[PDB]
């Protein structure tokens, strides 16, 4: 179907359904983590064709990054679901690792035998999706600074913790050039066209009532005339 | 450092009529206009130059004189100008015979001349023409003189060719902060420029070339809008 | 000097009356399509009654030709009618001030395909063929007067114009209709006030802006 329209008879219920799926589910399993990652991918494609904004997606990015490197004082405002799954300093960060490689039913059936290769795979999948969605939407939205601020703080936490990854560093430089490029001028929403003076149109050019009035005029005129002629004759 | 007004919704400025005499405004008096009504026989009709010259000659007047088309187009450009939208001018037609006609800034004039002529004969006999919403009189015949119906602190100037040309924005910005301006515009086809010498303070010109009266009104009006920042 | 389409160098102003309703018919002689003069005629023709407004065209020509920039001789008038015919008007024309004589003159122009005076040295109304860029000057800045466009000060705009760049403006003379008539030609669109204007006051505002810009 066509997603780029404003209202769709089946897509907008599907949008809010995957919205509920994106938000309400609990994050206890890497299976559900990959489920959320591929939901992020499909809504990113939907907005590749449609170009709108989703705060549930930016909160989702926050949630996934902090539930990966929970391993607590820097971001306690998130209320995570699982504290046990963290990635220590054992990443290989080799370029020939497993890519996003979406084989859906296969991955969701062998997820519970979870290797750190697959954890870094879904992590980098979320990383590439976040980079693409930022580059297509986030720089164009006006609140970009405070939208991306918690993501930027989590990324600086990543770099200070590890200092070995490269895609976080490149995303840092990209959002840095974005915040150096944007001007961030305050709002001017309430400023309207002054209304004009009202205008009006001029007006220019009952049969029973008309006939009544004409007969009254006839009666008056002929009665007065007959009285005058009577009195002339009498004198 | 300066707070906002509590209401920021746009509201229509109040219509400036002859009753109110305080608010600074502009007044245009299309003077020496030619609006006579004749009776042919079954029906009355407004005198026009082009169509009826044998009976105009039977009157004996000038086909050159009896021209209402220029008053018509002057009224069009005036009441379509942006300052009428802002509600800051009102107009008065001073007929050659002696009528004073007050035209409210809210009226929507019919633009084809036969409709305008029917409107004008209905006005010059009925003395008043009401809106189709019918709560107000737009075209009111009022009584001489214009000094009796003008604002109290006003300046009355004539549009003459032989006066030295000035810049209309300069003159309007030279005016005081509550001293309104009233321009006498000669709505004659062709004639002398000395009819309102007992009414006015001074004469001004706007170009080294003669103008049509509609263009003169448009020049003065756009200079006024440029001055008052519209 | 009298400006013409053959000169394409000197700084000048060009006005374009887009979709201007100048339509004729023969009833047993000719007639212009007047909106008020006949309505059952337009209903027989199937054409919309509220479109044929040569009165508005006449108002625009009258204001433009009597404007002082026209007397100084710095403009030229092109009319692109609703049926696709280009009409060229020179700054030396004394147009009729009456709608009836204007109607007769337009229908005689449409049925002669040329108009020359009794002086007969050079024509006044020229029927010529679309497009218009063949007769436009070289360095033409093309603007359309639209309401949805941002507002500008005409003084600042003509100041920001170049030295010898001529200026061409496009105004729609129709009653109701969208302003997307000449997007294939035009560079940009501007607005003039926060209030919706008309054709006559639009061209008058622009010619007075040009007058005060070029110090006439």
């Amino acid at each position: 179907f066509s997603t780029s329209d404003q209202y769709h008879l089946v897509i907008t219920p599907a949008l809010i359904l995957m919205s509920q799926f994106l938000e309400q589910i609990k994050f206890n399993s890497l299976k559900r983590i990959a489920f959320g990652a591929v939901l992020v991918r499909i809504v990113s494609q939907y907005q590749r064709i449609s170009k709108r904004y989703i705060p549930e997606v930016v909160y989702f990015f926050q949630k996934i990054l902090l539930t990966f490197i929970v391993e607590p004082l820097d971001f306690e405002n998130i209320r995570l679901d699982s504290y046990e799954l963290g990635l220590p300093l054992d990443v290989d960060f080799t370029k020939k690792r497993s890519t996003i490689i979406p084989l859906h039913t296969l991955s969701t059936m062998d997820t519970e035998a979870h290797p750190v290769d697959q954890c870094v795979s879904v992590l980098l999948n979320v990383m590439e999706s976040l980079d693409a969605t930022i580059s297509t939407v986030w720089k164009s939205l006006p609140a970009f600074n405070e939208i991306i601020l918690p993501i930027q703080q989590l990324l600086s936490a990543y770099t200070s913790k590890y200092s070995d990854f490269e895609k976080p560093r490149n995303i840092l430089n990209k959002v840095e050039k974005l915040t150096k490029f944007t001007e961030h001028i305050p709002l001017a929403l309430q400023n309207h066209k002054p209304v004009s003076i009202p205008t009006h149109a001029p007006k220019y050019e009952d049969r029973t009532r008309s006939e009544i009035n004409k007969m009254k005029a006839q009666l008056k005129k002929e009665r007065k005339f007959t009285m005058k002629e009577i009195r002339k004759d009498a004198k | 450092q300066k707070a906002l007004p509590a209401s920021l919704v746009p509201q229509a400025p109040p219509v400036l009529t002859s009753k109110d005499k305080i608010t600074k405004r502009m007044i245009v008096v299309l003077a020496m206009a030619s609006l006579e009504t004749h009776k042919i026989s079954d029906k009355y009709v407004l005198l026009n130059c082009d169509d009826h010259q044998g009976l105009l000659k039977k009157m004996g007047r000038d086909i050159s004189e009896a021209r209402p088309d220029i008053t018509h187009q002057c009224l069009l450009t005036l009441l379509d100008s942006p300052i009428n939208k802002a509600g800051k001018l009102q107009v008065y037609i001073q007929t050659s015979r002696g009528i004073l006609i007050e035209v409210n800034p809210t009226v929507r004039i019919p633009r084809t001349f036969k409709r305008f002529s029917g409107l004008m004969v209905q006005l010059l006999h009925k003395l008043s023409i009401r809106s189709v919403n019918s709560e107000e009189k737009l075209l009111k015949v009022i009584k001489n003189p214009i000094t009796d119906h003008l604002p109290t602190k006003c300046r009355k100037v004539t549009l003459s060719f032989d006066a030295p040309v000035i810049r209309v924005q300069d003159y309007i910005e030279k005016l005081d902060d509550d001293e309104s301006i009233c321009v006498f515009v000669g709505a004659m086809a062709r004639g002398k420029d000395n009819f309102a010498d007992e009414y006015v303070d001074e004469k001004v010109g706007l170009s080294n070339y003669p103008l049509s009266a509609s263009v003169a009104c448009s020049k003065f009006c756009h200079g006024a809008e440029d001055a008052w920042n519209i | 000097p009298v400006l013409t389409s053959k000169d394409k160098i000197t700084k000048r102003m060009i006005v374009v009356l887009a979709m201007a309703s100048l339509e004729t018919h023969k009833i047993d002689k000719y007639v212009l399509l007047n909106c008020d003069d006949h309505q059952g005629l337009l209903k027989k023709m199937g054409r919309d009654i509220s479109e044929a407004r040569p009165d508005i065209t006449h108002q625009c020509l009258l204001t433009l030709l009597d404007s002082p920039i026209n007397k100084a001789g710095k403009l030229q008038v092109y009319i692109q009618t609703s049926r696709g015919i280009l009409i060229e008007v020179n700054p030396t024309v004394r147009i009729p001030r009456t709608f009836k004589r204007f109607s007769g003159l337009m229908v005689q122009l449409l049925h002669k395909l040329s108009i020359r005076s009794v002086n007969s040295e050079e024509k006044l109304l020229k029927v010529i063929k679309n497009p218009i860029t063949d007769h436009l000057p070289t360095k033409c800045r093309k603007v359309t007067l639209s309401f949805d466009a941002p507002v500008i000060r005409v003084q600042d705009y003509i100041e920001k114009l170049d030295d010898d760049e001529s200026i061409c403006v496009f105004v729609g003379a129709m009653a109701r209709g969208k302003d997307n008539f000449a997007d294939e030609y035009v560079d940009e669109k501007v607005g003039l006030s926060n209030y919706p204007l008309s054709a006559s006051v639009a061209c008058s505002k622009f010619c007075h802006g040009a007058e005060d810009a070029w110090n006439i």
């Binding site: 009202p198 | 379509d80 019919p110 409709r115 | 909106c35 509220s50 204007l197």
Partner: peptide, 10 residues
């Protein structure tokens, strides 16, 4: 409301 359209008819 009205903006440069002329007027109605009967």
């Amino acid at each position: 409301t009205d903006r440069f359209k002329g007027d109605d008819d009967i």
